Each structure stands twice: as structure tokens, then as C-alpha cells.
Amino acid sequence: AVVKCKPTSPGRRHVVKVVNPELHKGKPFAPLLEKNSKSGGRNNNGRITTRHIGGGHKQAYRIVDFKRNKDGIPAVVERLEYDPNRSANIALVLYKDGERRYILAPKGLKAGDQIQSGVDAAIKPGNTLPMRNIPVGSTVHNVEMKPGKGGQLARSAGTYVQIVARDGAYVTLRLRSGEMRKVEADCRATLGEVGNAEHMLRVLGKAGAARWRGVRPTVRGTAMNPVDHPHGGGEGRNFGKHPVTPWGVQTKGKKTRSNKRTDKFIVRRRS
């Protein structure tokens, strides 16, 4: 649901919490947890490559099965857990032979529903099967790119890809950006949109809300001296320069897509 907090204190006034009481309030499933040390946006050289990242609360990586290669084995969803690594929810699904795994939670999924993988599965939210078996025009998610790589597209909350058309081995996909990209037909895909579609409407309210989220303070360009940023300088809010990045690269209108090897799959660019 959408909880709108009461302004009993400034900074709590605008906060909008999103509760999902179907979530498992207990502890996570131990056999699928591994350490996830934070980086701080620093590479091997130690230099901070990406800024505004670091600090925040400690979390643990939950191994989510994106591959979904359990062909011919039914599975029943036990419960819905909270995965801090995503923007969506994950479900601890149990197989008939006793194997437990974590899969991305689709929209219409409850604690106790039946799913399965392979080209046998009926078109029902949760089931995975190659796109050469999936009806043209249906709504899917967690789409693979290389037949067996794992699943790349549509992985955020309430995000889905719509299988537009099929030309032999190629499948036209209207992505979330409004960009149509062709993909090999032997790629696995999962039916149904990703759940927790209300993750977007959540507001943070507090400045420190983003601080434990992981984000650090971002300083604007016109608040620094010229040696630090191309905008900088000034004796009182002067700009007179064309909007750039901290490295002279033009921003606010400048396509920097330099691929050329993947242009062969793009039908329509983002519009």
C-alpha cells in the first residue's frame, strides 16, 4: 500500500512509505546468501571512478536464479522476501525435488502458486520458456540476450517487455525505453510484468534517507572553483558557458552512443 506519514516532525512531513504486508517479516534463506562488500565507487587503482556513491547500510547478496533452466520440474512459491539489491521483490520458490531458489517476483504472484520452466509451460505469469513458443504480442520480462546468458532486459519493479513480432530467428521487442531491438528467438523469457509496481511512487523525504540508501551528496558545477569544474568560477552566480560534464563532454543534448557493432539489432532508437 501507499503510506503517507504524519508530519509529527519536519523531515517526516513529505515521506511516503510503501508497505507490502505480504512480505516475509522473518529472516532470509541462509543457503543462498553470500557476502556483498561495498565499493564506494572505487576501482582497482583506488581512484573514485563514479562519484556520489558510498556509505549507507550494509546488505547481503541473495543469489537470484536469472537463468531459470529447470526444465520439466514444477515449482511452488513459498513466500516473498525483501531483496535490498533490487527495486523489486524476490520469491523463495521450492521445486518438487527439493531444490530452493530465488526468482524475480512477477506481478500476479501469491504465496502458494505453481510455476515451472521449459517449452512445456502454459502461458501463465511466472513460467519461463523460449520466445519461439511464446505468443506474439504477450507481455514478458527478464529477457535473455544470448541463448543461455541469464536474462538482461526488464528487471526493475513493474517493468516489462512486449514481444512485438517474429521473423524466423529474430524477435522484435518493444523495450521499456520505447526502443525496438531484435533478439534471437531461442532466448528464455519470463511471462508477466515484474511485481512491486509501486516502488516508483515512493519518496524519501529526508536528506539522510538517501545517505543510508547509499547515495552521497552531489555538488553542482557552479559551486566550485574553475580548477575543479568547467562551470566553476564567478563572483556570484555567473554561468555563460555551455553545459558540460566535469570532463568537458557536452551534456544536455549530445548523443554519445559509440557502438557500431550492435546497430544491426536496433530497429528504432529511443523516442
Question: Contacts with RNA in 57-86 (CB under 7 A)?
Answer: 57-61, 63-64, 72-74, 81-82, 84-86
Contact set for RNA, span 149-168 (CB under 7 A): 149-150, 152-159, 162, 164-165, 167
Q: What number of other Cβ atoms are within 10 A of residue 165's Cβ?
A: 14
Q: How far is the CB of 188 from RNA (least distance, A)?
A: 10
Q: How far is the CB of 16 from RNA (least distance, A)?
A: 7
Taking CB under 7 A as the binding criterion, the range among 55-63, 117-125, 126-134 that sits at the site for RNA is: 55-63
- For β-strands 90-95 and 100-104, DSSP reports them as antiparallel
Q: Which residues pair with 23 in a beta bridge?
A: 80
Q: Quick check: 248 binds RNA (CB under 7 A)?
A: yes
- The C-alpha cell that represents 78 in the structure block: 513459498
Q: What is the DSSP letter of 203?
A: B
Q: Please pick, from the candidates 22, 52, 120, 133, the single residue that binds RNA as defined by CB under 7 A.
A: 52
Q: 170 — phi, psi (to 5°)?
A: -100, 145
Q: Please pick, from the candidates 118, 124, 130, 222, the single residue that binds RNA as defined by CB under 7 A.
A: 222
Q: How far is the CB of 246 from RNA (least distance, A)?
A: 4
> 3-class DSSP state for residue 23?
strand
Q: How far is the CB of 255 from RNA (least distance, A)?
A: 4
Q: Quick check: 257 binds RNA (CB under 7 A)?
A: yes
CB contact set of 146 (below 8 Å; sequence gap of 6+) = 184, 187
Q: How far is the CB of 232 from RNA (least distance, A)?
A: 8
Place of cell 512477477: 106
By CB under 7 A, the count of residues binding RNA is 161
